[PDB]
Design a protein around this ligand. Structure first.
Ligand code: ADP
Ligand code: MG
Length: 215
């Protein structure tokens, strides 16, 4: 018998509204989700890299600074792994849903007005939630040097959970798993995802490994 303590949290009200808007509205082009995933990974990698300039020991948990992308058609998942800074449990609580972001309301208003489209979500400090354009459930595993490995999970509906993660140790960094919506499984096609990764990684200064899994 396995035992696990799970803590349940409620999304900040405006973040809840945004997630509802992202999930319950048709958007023609949803490619932004991948740009946001890679962007976040690159930012996380920059953070640990600059920390290592002033403190070399911070890299001992995992020497390589890299991104891995794994489309898994059988599992119906897209996974992105980075060896960036990672998030502590409290980092996840704060950054992944409970704290208000000042861009949230203004983004929603601009979406409704036509002043902004969904592709601009990253400019408003809420890029993470673009994952729900293509995924029903998002799982975020993370390991920061300061904490144990934790896993954040949400299928929206106003709540998320966080628990200690006893799955494969990351060493350091973040593994985000998108459980893809049936109508968005095209994003797992080998050539399509290859192309999109190349397109959305032109300025990314870390190696990217694209691993196509077949069963
Ligand atoms: N791969 C990751 N590694 C570390 N932290 C992350 C990662 N992805 C997201 N985060 C955290 O979640 C926050 C929200 O990301 P996002 O909504 O894209 O806003 P922004 O990138 O503008 O900060 C980030 O600022 C970061 O603190
Ligand atoms: Mg971001």
């Amino acid at each position: 018998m396995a035992e696990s303590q799970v803590e349940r949290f409620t999304f900040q009200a405006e973040i809840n509204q945004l997630m509802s808007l992202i999930i319950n509205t048709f958007y023609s082009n949803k490619e932004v989700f991948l740009r946001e995933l890679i962007s976040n990974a690159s930012d996380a990698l920059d953070k640990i890299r600059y920390q290592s300039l002033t403190d070399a020991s911070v890299l001992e948990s995992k020497t390589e600074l890299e991104i891995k992308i794994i489309p898994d058609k059988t599992a119906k998942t897209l996974t992105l792994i980075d060896s960036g800074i990672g998030m502590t449990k409290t980092d996840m609580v704060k950054n992944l849903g409970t704290i208000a972001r000042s861009g949230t309301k203004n983004f929603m208003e601009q979406l409704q007005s036509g002043a902004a489209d969904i592709s601009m979500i990253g400019q408003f400090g809420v890029g993470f939630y673009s994952a729900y354009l293509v995924a029903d459930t998002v799982i975020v595993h993370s390991k920061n040097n300061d904490d144990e490995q934790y896993v954040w999970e949400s299928s929206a509906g106003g709540e998320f959970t966080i628990a200690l993660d006893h799955t494969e140790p990351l060493g350091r960094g973040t593994k985000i798993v998108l459980h893809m919506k049936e109508d968005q499984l095209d994003y797992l096609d080998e050539t399509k995802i290859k192309n999109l990764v190349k397109k959305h990684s032109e300025f990314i200064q870390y190696p990217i490994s694209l691993l196509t899994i077949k069963e």
